[PDB]
Amino acid sequence: AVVWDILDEVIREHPVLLNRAPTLHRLGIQAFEPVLIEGKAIQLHPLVCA
Amino acid sequence: VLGLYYMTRDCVNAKGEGMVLTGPKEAERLYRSGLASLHARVKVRITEYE
């Protein structure tokens, strides 16, 4: 579990890029600051999903 | 959008129509306490800025 603590420490300010094929226009790739959830689905904010 | 539309639509007759609220906080209270429905038309004291 110390690995989980380290993992929570590392990403605290580490943006990641989300991409949806096809990337029709440049909005198709965007940057987000992650939050860690159990499960296996990536969770988006609906507004940007539009 | 559906929620906002419902929230702002008024009706001719509703619970507590015509009363006067000294501030939007009291409007929120009267709604949450269930003594007036959202659609009821009322006079309210409001501050705005420019």
């Binding site: 579990a1 989980w4 860690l36 959830i37 159990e38 | 507590g16 009363m19 006067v20 000294t22 501030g23 906080k25 009291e26 929120e28 209270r29 009267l30 949450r32 306490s33 003594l35 006079k43 004291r45």
Partner: protein
Amino acid sequence: SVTEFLKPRLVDIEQVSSTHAKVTLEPLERGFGHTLGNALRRILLSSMPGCAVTEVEIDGVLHEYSTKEGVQEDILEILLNLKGLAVRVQGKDEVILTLNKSGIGPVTAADITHDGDVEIVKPQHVICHLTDENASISMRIKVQRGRGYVPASTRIHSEEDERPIGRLLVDACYSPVERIAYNVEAARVEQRTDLDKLVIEMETNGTIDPEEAIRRAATILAEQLEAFVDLR
């Protein structure tokens, strides 16, 4: 043991002001945050005992829209100001106060007839503006101790239709809370990620600090429950 439950820590309080404050709890079991927040909001809104101003009488007034010269604001505006009057009485549950003034400018609660049993918390509050000299305002207002909230259409009755010319009615916002909100979020401990973390945002008039109000609400609910808990 099955009886185990993760009691929360009073993880923080953040006072934006004497009236405005936030209180946060972490962690709580799944679904406990919602029930506790909902129950507290209910009790604060509908059952908190308070002292409020309910009637006003003015000699030249028969109805809420009775015209009056000299005063800057309308009668309904002064009614709203009275509704906003922050007042607490420690003595009798029913008190009558009088205000009489002739002066250009604001009519603050500082000019009410003071009494040792009653504290106006915010004397700086303005009831109205009186536009001119040789113009006077004279009123009597009635303050009462009650529980919850009562609007005008609720208090009016045919059993109390025997009213004189000079009687007006004000909504008695006894419960001193001005706003209660709570929101629920996720928190993690012991590699568990199925937990409730709770945030409460609160505004109340200057009668009491919000912490005191929350403690009072908790005590009320516990005293309600007490007849059931056979445990120590």
